[PDB]
Protein backbone atom coordinates (compact mmCIF):
# COMPACT_ATOMS: atom_id res chain seq x y z
CA UNK A 1 0.00 0.00 0.00
CA UNK A 2 2.19 2.86 -1.30
CA UNK A 3 -0.31 5.38 -2.72
CA UNK A 4 -0.62 6.00 -6.47
CA UNK A 5 1.72 8.71 -7.80
CA UNK A 6 -0.04 12.03 -8.55
CA UNK A 7 -1.49 12.00 -12.12
CA UNK A 8 1.02 14.58 -13.17
CA UNK A 9 4.35 14.60 -11.44
CA UNK A 10 4.99 17.60 -9.13
CA UNK A 11 8.77 17.24 -9.61
CA UNK A 12 8.84 18.65 -13.16
CA UNK A 13 10.82 21.87 -13.93
CA UNK A 14 9.77 22.39 -17.59
CA UNK A 15 12.21 23.76 -20.09
CA UNK A 16 15.83 22.66 -19.79
CA UNK A 17 19.20 23.49 -21.20
CA UNK A 18 20.64 20.79 -23.47
CA UNK A 19 24.12 20.72 -24.98
CA UNK A 20 26.27 18.14 -26.71
CA UNK A 21 29.77 19.60 -26.65
CA UNK A 22 31.22 18.32 -23.38
CA UNK A 23 32.54 14.86 -22.44
CA UNK A 24 30.29 12.45 -20.52
CA UNK A 25 31.46 9.88 -18.04
CA UNK A 26 28.92 7.13 -17.39
CA UNK A 27 30.55 6.24 -14.09
CA UNK A 28 29.84 9.76 -12.93
CA UNK A 29 26.35 9.69 -14.49
CA UNK A 30 25.74 6.55 -12.44
CA UNK A 31 26.83 8.34 -9.23
CA UNK A 32 24.66 11.34 -10.11
CA UNK A 33 21.76 8.85 -10.49
CA UNK A 34 22.11 6.67 -7.39
CA UNK A 35 18.52 5.47 -7.46
CA UNK A 36 18.80 3.90 -10.93
CA UNK A 37 19.33 0.17 -10.38
CA UNK A 38 21.38 -2.35 -12.35
CA UNK A 39 20.31 -2.54 -16.02
CA UNK A 40 18.87 1.02 -15.76
CA UNK A 41 15.69 0.27 -13.83
CA UNK A 42 13.96 2.77 -11.63
CA UNK A 43 10.58 3.02 -9.91
CA UNK A 44 9.65 5.72 -7.38
CA UNK A 45 10.30 5.02 -3.71
CA UNK A 46 7.24 6.95 -2.46
CA UNK A 47 4.29 6.05 -4.68
CA UNK A 48 3.28 3.44 -7.30
CA UNK A 49 3.44 4.63 -10.93
CA UNK A 50 0.70 3.36 -13.28
CA UNK A 51 3.36 3.83 -16.01
CA UNK A 52 5.39 0.63 -16.49
CA UNK A 53 7.56 1.76 -19.25
CA UNK A 54 10.26 0.02 -21.29
CA UNK A 55 12.34 2.47 -23.30
CA UNK A 56 13.64 0.84 -26.45
CA UNK A 57 16.56 2.31 -28.34
CA UNK A 58 17.63 0.92 -31.75
CA UNK A 59 21.39 0.96 -31.80
CA UNK A 60 24.66 0.25 -33.56
CA UNK A 61 27.98 2.12 -33.14
CA UNK A 62 26.58 5.25 -31.53
CA UNK A 63 28.13 5.01 -28.03
CA UNK A 64 28.84 8.72 -27.78
CA UNK A 65 25.22 9.67 -28.57
CA UNK A 66 24.07 7.08 -26.08
CA UNK A 67 26.07 8.62 -23.21
CA UNK A 68 24.38 11.95 -23.87
CA UNK A 69 21.02 10.15 -24.08
CA UNK A 70 21.66 8.54 -20.73
CA UNK A 71 23.00 11.73 -19.08
CA UNK A 72 19.90 13.72 -20.05
CA UNK A 73 17.03 11.18 -19.91
CA UNK A 74 17.72 9.40 -16.67
CA UNK A 75 17.12 12.52 -14.52
CA UNK A 76 14.03 13.40 -16.56
CA UNK A 77 12.51 9.95 -16.43
CA UNK A 78 12.83 9.82 -12.65
CA UNK A 79 11.22 13.27 -12.27
CA UNK A 80 8.33 11.88 -14.33
CA UNK A 81 7.87 9.24 -11.65
CA UNK A 82 7.87 6.32 -14.14
CA UNK A 83 8.51 2.67 -13.30
CA UNK A 84 10.91 2.24 -16.20
CA UNK A 85 13.79 0.30 -17.79
CA UNK A 86 16.19 1.16 -20.57
CA UNK A 87 16.96 -1.38 -23.38
CA UNK A 88 19.55 -0.63 -26.05
CA UNK A 89 18.97 -3.09 -28.89
CA UNK A 90 22.37 -3.45 -30.50
CA UNK A 91 22.38 -4.90 -34.07
CA UNK A 92 25.21 -7.47 -34.31
CA UNK A 93 27.34 -7.56 -37.46
CA UNK A 94 28.01 -5.00 -40.14
CA UNK A 95 25.26 -5.49 -42.70
CA UNK A 96 22.42 -3.09 -43.64
CA UNK A 97 20.69 -1.55 -40.56
CA UNK A 98 17.06 -2.38 -39.64
CA UNK A 99 15.64 0.16 -37.18
CA UNK A 100 12.10 -1.25 -36.92
CA UNK A 101 13.09 -4.90 -36.56
CA UNK A 102 15.32 -3.97 -33.62
CA UNK A 103 12.40 -2.14 -32.08
CA UNK A 104 10.32 -5.37 -32.29
CA UNK A 105 13.13 -7.33 -30.63
CA UNK A 106 13.09 -4.75 -27.85
CA UNK A 107 9.39 -5.12 -27.24
CA UNK A 108 9.57 -8.91 -27.15
CA UNK A 109 12.74 -9.10 -24.99
CA UNK A 110 11.78 -6.40 -22.47
CA UNK A 111 8.57 -8.27 -21.72
CA UNK A 112 10.70 -11.18 -20.49
CA UNK A 113 12.10 -8.97 -17.69
CA UNK A 114 9.00 -7.41 -16.29
CA UNK A 115 5.33 -6.82 -16.85
CA UNK A 116 5.81 -3.63 -18.93
CA UNK A 117 2.56 -2.19 -20.35
CA UNK A 118 3.99 0.83 -22.20
CA UNK A 119 6.78 1.07 -24.72
CA UNK A 120 8.71 4.16 -25.66
CA UNK A 121 10.64 3.81 -28.93
CA UNK A 122 13.41 6.44 -29.00
CA UNK A 123 16.18 7.13 -31.46
CA UNK A 124 19.44 7.52 -29.51
CA UNK A 125 20.18 11.01 -30.77
CA UNK A 126 16.95 12.76 -29.69
CA UNK A 127 16.80 14.55 -26.32
CA UNK A 128 13.69 16.27 -25.03
CA UNK A 129 14.03 19.94 -23.96
CA UNK A 130 11.09 20.04 -21.64
CA UNK A 131 10.36 17.50 -18.93
CA UNK A 132 6.64 18.10 -19.31
CA UNK A 133 6.90 15.96 -22.50
CA UNK A 134 5.71 12.64 -20.93
CA UNK A 135 7.73 9.54 -21.88
CA UNK A 136 4.79 7.20 -21.22
CA UNK A 137 1.59 5.92 -22.97
CA UNK A 138 -1.82 7.56 -23.60
CA UNK A 139 -5.18 6.31 -24.71
CA UNK A 140 -4.00 6.78 -28.31
CA UNK A 141 -0.48 6.17 -29.75
CA UNK A 142 1.74 9.05 -28.68
CA UNK A 143 4.20 10.94 -30.83
CA UNK A 144 6.75 12.59 -28.49
CA UNK A 145 9.48 14.20 -30.54
CA UNK A 146 7.08 16.69 -32.16
CA UNK A 147 9.15 19.91 -32.46
CA UNK A 148 12.68 18.90 -33.40
CA UNK A 149 15.29 21.61 -33.91
CA UNK A 150 16.39 20.01 -37.17
CA UNK A 151 12.83 20.45 -38.55
CA UNK A 152 12.54 24.11 -37.36
CA UNK A 153 10.88 23.23 -34.07
CA UNK A 154 7.73 21.80 -35.76
CA UNK A 155 6.54 18.62 -37.46
CA UNK A 156 8.09 18.06 -40.87
CA UNK A 157 4.63 16.84 -42.02
CA UNK A 158 1.51 16.27 -39.94
CA UNK A 159 1.66 12.48 -40.37
CA UNK A 160 5.26 12.30 -39.20
CA UNK A 161 5.66 9.66 -36.52
CA UNK A 162 9.47 9.21 -36.38
CA UNK A 163 12.03 9.98 -33.69
CA UNK A 164 10.41 9.22 -30.38
CA UNK A 165 7.04 7.63 -29.75
CA UNK A 166 5.11 5.59 -27.19
CA UNK A 167 2.60 2.77 -27.72
CA UNK A 168 0.80 0.89 -24.93
CA UNK A 169 1.26 -2.91 -25.03
CA UNK A 170 -2.29 -3.19 -26.43
CA UNK A 171 -1.70 -0.61 -29.18
CA UNK A 172 1.52 -2.26 -30.35
CA UNK A 173 -0.12 -5.72 -30.34
CA UNK A 174 -3.12 -4.37 -32.24
CA UNK A 175 -0.99 -3.33 -35.16
CA UNK A 176 1.08 -6.61 -35.21
CA UNK A 177 4.00 -4.48 -34.05
CA UNK A 178 6.31 -2.91 -36.54
CA UNK A 179 7.28 -4.03 -40.05
CA UNK A 180 10.40 -6.28 -40.27
CA UNK A 181 11.38 -5.55 -43.86
CA UNK A 182 12.44 -1.91 -43.94
CA UNK A 183 16.21 -2.33 -44.42
CA UNK A 184 18.23 0.88 -44.58
CA UNK A 185 16.97 4.38 -44.02
CA UNK A 186 13.48 5.71 -44.40
CA UNK A 187 9.80 4.84 -44.41
CA UNK A 188 9.37 2.44 -41.54
CA UNK A 189 7.93 5.20 -39.27
CA UNK A 190 5.41 6.07 -41.97
CA UNK A 191 4.48 2.43 -42.27
CA UNK A 192 3.95 2.40 -38.53
CA UNK A 193 1.77 5.52 -38.80
CA UNK A 194 -0.26 3.72 -41.50
CA UNK A 195 -0.71 0.69 -39.24
CA UNK A 196 -2.11 2.77 -36.44
CA UNK A 197 -4.62 4.57 -38.70
CA UNK A 198 -5.64 1.25 -40.33
CA UNK A 199 -6.43 -0.01 -36.89
CA UNK A 200 -8.76 2.87 -35.89
CA UNK A 201 -6.27 4.99 -33.92
CA UNK A 202 -5.10 8.60 -34.12
CA UNK A 203 -1.86 10.22 -33.05
CA UNK A 204 -1.80 12.06 -29.69
CA UNK A 205 0.94 14.74 -29.20
CA UNK A 206 2.10 17.36 -26.66
CA UNK A 207 2.03 20.97 -27.91
CA UNK A 208 4.98 22.29 -29.91
CA UNK A 209 6.53 24.05 -26.92
CA UNK A 210 6.46 21.10 -24.50
CA UNK A 211 7.49 18.80 -27.46
CA UNK A 212 10.60 20.71 -28.34
CA UNK A 213 13.43 18.22 -28.94
CA UNK A 214 17.14 18.35 -29.78
CA UNK A 215 18.81 16.17 -32.35
CA UNK A 216 22.56 15.52 -32.00
CA UNK A 217 24.05 16.55 -35.39
CA UNK A 218 26.13 13.75 -36.93
CA UNK A 219 27.15 12.65 -40.39
CA UNK A 220 25.67 9.69 -42.25
CA UNK A 221 25.95 6.17 -40.88
CA UNK A 222 27.39 3.66 -43.27
CA UNK A 223 25.19 0.60 -43.87
CA UNK A 224 21.97 2.59 -43.44
CA UNK A 225 21.62 4.07 -46.94
CA UNK A 226 18.17 5.25 -48.11
CA UNK A 227 15.96 2.27 -48.91
CA UNK A 228 14.82 2.71 -52.54
CA UNK A 229 11.85 0.33 -52.03
CA UNK A 230 10.49 2.49 -49.18
CA UNK A 231 7.90 4.49 -51.21
CA UNK A 232 6.41 1.23 -52.60
CA UNK A 233 6.39 -0.43 -49.19
CA UNK A 234 4.50 2.33 -47.38
CA UNK A 235 1.82 2.26 -50.13
CA UNK A 236 0.92 -1.35 -49.16
CA UNK A 237 0.99 -1.41 -45.34
CA UNK A 238 -2.66 -2.28 -45.04
CA UNK A 239 -2.15 -5.60 -46.73
CA UNK A 240 1.43 -6.27 -45.53
CA UNK A 241 0.85 -5.52 -41.87
CA UNK A 242 -1.39 -8.55 -41.62
CA UNK A 243 1.51 -10.94 -41.85
CA UNK A 244 4.67 -8.89 -41.44
CA UNK A 245 5.58 -7.90 -37.89
CA UNK A 246 5.35 -9.53 -34.52
CA UNK A 247 3.69 -12.59 -36.06
CA UNK A 248 6.57 -13.10 -38.56
CA UNK A 249 9.52 -12.11 -36.30
CA UNK A 250 12.58 -14.25 -35.48
CA UNK A 251 16.03 -13.23 -34.27
CA UNK A 252 18.91 -14.64 -32.21
CA UNK A 253 20.09 -12.80 -29.09
CA UNK A 254 23.92 -13.08 -28.98
CA UNK A 255 24.43 -11.26 -25.69
CA UNK A 256 22.59 -9.43 -22.86
CA UNK A 257 24.72 -7.02 -20.69
CA UNK A 258 23.25 -5.36 -17.62
CA UNK A 259 25.11 -2.10 -17.27
CA UNK A 260 24.37 0.26 -14.38
CA UNK A 261 22.30 2.64 -16.56
CA UNK A 262 20.95 0.26 -19.28
CA UNK A 263 20.43 -3.30 -20.44
CA UNK A 264 22.07 -3.87 -23.81
CA UNK A 265 20.73 -6.69 -25.94
CA UNK A 266 23.07 -7.64 -28.78
CA UNK A 267 21.03 -9.39 -31.49
CA UNK A 268 21.48 -11.00 -34.88
CA UNK A 269 18.44 -9.88 -36.96
CA UNK A 270 19.80 -11.23 -40.25
CA UNK A 271 19.73 -9.68 -43.69
CA UNK A 272 16.88 -9.30 -46.23
CA UNK A 273 14.95 -12.42 -47.16
Ligand SMILES: CC(=O)N[C@H]1[C@H](OC[C@H]2O[C@@H](O[C@H]3[C@H](O)[C@@H](O)[C@H](O)O[C@@H]3CO)[C@H](O)[C@@H](O)[C@H]2O)O[C@H](CO)[C@@H](O)[C@@H]1O
Pocket residue numbers: 150156162163185186187188189190230231234
Ligand atom coordinates in the same frame (compact mmCIF):
# COMPACT_ATOMS: atom_id res chain seq x y z
C1 LIG B 1 9.19 7.37 -46.92
C2 LIG B 1 10.28 8.15 -46.24
O1 LIG B 1 11.41 8.28 -46.73
N1 LIG B 1 9.93 8.70 -45.09
C3 LIG B 1 10.88 9.51 -44.32
C4 LIG B 1 10.67 10.99 -44.59
O2 LIG B 1 11.06 11.19 -45.94
C5 LIG B 1 10.70 12.46 -46.45
C6 LIG B 1 11.81 12.78 -47.46
O3 LIG B 1 13.05 12.95 -46.79
C7 LIG B 1 14.17 13.37 -47.57
O4 LIG B 1 15.42 13.28 -46.83
C8 LIG B 1 15.62 14.32 -45.88
C9 LIG B 1 15.23 13.86 -44.47
O5 LIG B 1 13.83 13.57 -44.39
C10 LIG B 1 15.70 14.84 -43.38
O6 LIG B 1 15.86 14.17 -42.14
C11 LIG B 1 17.05 15.53 -43.66
O7 LIG B 1 17.12 16.74 -42.93
O8 LIG B 1 17.31 15.81 -45.01
C12 LIG B 1 17.12 14.66 -45.81
C13 LIG B 1 17.75 14.96 -47.17
O9 LIG B 1 17.34 16.24 -47.58
C14 LIG B 1 14.31 12.62 -48.91
O10 LIG B 1 15.19 13.33 -49.76
C15 LIG B 1 12.96 12.38 -49.61
O11 LIG B 1 13.05 11.54 -50.74
C16 LIG B 1 11.99 11.75 -48.59
O12 LIG B 1 12.56 10.51 -48.15
O13 LIG B 1 11.41 11.84 -43.74
C17 LIG B 1 11.16 11.62 -42.37
C18 LIG B 1 11.89 12.70 -41.59
O14 LIG B 1 13.29 12.58 -41.81
C19 LIG B 1 11.62 10.20 -42.04
O15 LIG B 1 11.42 9.98 -40.65
C20 LIG B 1 10.76 9.21 -42.83
O16 LIG B 1 11.20 7.88 -42.69
Ligand SMILES: O=c1ccn([C@@H]2O[C@H](COP(=O)(O)OP(=O)(O)O)[C@@H](O)[C@H]2O)c(=O)[nH]1
Pocket residue numbers: 057058059060061062097099122123124125126185215221222223224
Ligand atom coordinates in the same frame (compact mmCIF):
# COMPACT_ATOMS: atom_id res chain seq x y z
O1 LIG C 1 24.18 2.98 -37.87
C1 LIG C 1 23.17 3.30 -37.28
C2 LIG C 1 21.98 3.74 -37.92
C3 LIG C 1 20.96 4.21 -37.04
N1 LIG C 1 20.97 3.93 -35.67
C4 LIG C 1 19.81 4.22 -34.75
O2 LIG C 1 18.61 4.48 -35.48
C5 LIG C 1 18.19 5.83 -35.44
C6 LIG C 1 17.75 6.34 -36.84
O3 LIG C 1 18.73 6.81 -37.76
P1 LIG C 1 19.20 8.36 -38.19
O4 LIG C 1 20.24 8.84 -37.25
O5 LIG C 1 19.78 8.41 -39.57
O6 LIG C 1 17.94 9.40 -38.13
P2 LIG C 1 18.02 10.93 -37.54
O7 LIG C 1 17.73 10.90 -36.05
O8 LIG C 1 19.33 11.55 -37.92
O9 LIG C 1 16.96 11.80 -38.16
C7 LIG C 1 19.38 6.53 -34.80
O10 LIG C 1 19.02 7.72 -34.12
C8 LIG C 1 19.98 5.46 -33.88
O11 LIG C 1 19.23 5.23 -32.69
C9 LIG C 1 22.16 3.49 -35.09
O12 LIG C 1 22.29 3.36 -33.84
N2 LIG C 1 23.24 3.19 -35.91
Ligand SMILES: [Mn+2]
Pocket residue numbers: 125215216218
Ligand atom coordinates in the same frame (compact mmCIF):
# COMPACT_ATOMS: atom_id res chain seq x y z
MN1 LIG D 1 20.06 11.10 -36.33
